[PDB]
Write a protein that binds this DNA or RNA. Structure first.
Length: 260
RNA sequence: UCGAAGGUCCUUCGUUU
RNA sequence: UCGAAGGUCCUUCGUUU
């Protein structure tokens, strides 16, 4: 069985021009990170011209490039990749797609699978490690247990602490809000707080980067969602880093282009 | 994100002697 | 006339910190 291994090139050719960025938000170039995604096929791919996807950070050019050709490796490895492809499309999102990393040539990511398979308290308190949350996706443990919500860590607010003033009038402090509503007590009252961002699955080929009722309401919801400030002790860190996650959310748009 | 309700129209069927 | 089952779209609301 002949195999063909493609890499999905992501390079930011047109960053926000810095006139267009009024708010001077951080830019997240895809080329700054070595971990990417590839497509695995049986029959090769009919050459596709390179195309843009429009993200918050700018115009990102997608190039489908052939990294390796003609090989094949076992069956169990062929079967394992499928579990990652599912994981990407079922658990992360909602012929084969797999993670790659640098060795200056590219191979299948060795550190991907065991973060997840690494994931199978307390009286002495939660400890805040700044390097944990640097590139991170966090989920709140205290709500939405069915389908947990996930956020990028946008900022670490260092002057803020769980005893800082809660933004809404009904509560004095974050400590109080979480105690009152969720019955949660914090073991660490000196920890900073986290700013978040969220995007997930939409179409990136055009630039939203006449609304109905159901959509005008999600506009407000998404808006408030991004203004949320979260508590690190009350949040779990997702194994897949935010940097790889940002590449992952372009996959539906990119795979759409290859089909059409 | 997950839900709730009101309305509107369409499809399929029941209902009379 | 009164109903059943399924769907479409519009509108209103809850849900986050």
């Amino acid at each position: 069985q002949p195999c063909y291994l493609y890499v999905i090139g992501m390079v930011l050719t047109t960053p926000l021009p810095d006139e267009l960025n009024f708010r001077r938000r951080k830019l997240y170039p895809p080329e700054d990170t070595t971990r990417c995604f590839g497509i695995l096929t049986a029959k090769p791919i009919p050459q596709i011209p390179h195309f843009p996807v429009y993200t918050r950070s700018g115009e990102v050019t997608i190039s489908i490039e052939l990294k390796k050709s003609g090989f094949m490796l076992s069956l169990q490895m062929l079967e394992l990749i499928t579990r990652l492809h599912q994981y990407i499309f079922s658990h992360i999102l909602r012929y084969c797609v797999l993670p790659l990393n640098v060795v200056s040539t590219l191979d299948i990511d060795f550190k991907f699978m065991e973060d997840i398979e690494k994931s199978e308290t307390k009286e002495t308190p939660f400890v805040f490690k700044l390097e944990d949350y640097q590139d991170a996706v966090i989920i709140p443990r205290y709500r939405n247990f069915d389908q947990p919500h996930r956020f990028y860590v946008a900022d670490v607010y260092t002057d803020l602490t769980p005893l800082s003033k809660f933004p809404s009038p009904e509560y004095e402090t974050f400590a109080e809000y979480y105690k009152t509503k969720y019955n949660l007590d914090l073991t660490n009252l000196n920890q900073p707080l986290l700013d978040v961002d969220h995007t997930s699955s939409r179409l990136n080929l055009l630039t939203p980067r006449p609304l109905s009722s159901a959509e005008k309401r999600k506009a407000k919801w998404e808006s408030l969602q991004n203004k949320q400030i979260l508590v690190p002790e009350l949040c779990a860190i997702h194994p897949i880093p935010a940097s790889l996650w940002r590449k992952a959310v372009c996959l539906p748009s990119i795979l759409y282009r290859l089909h059409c």
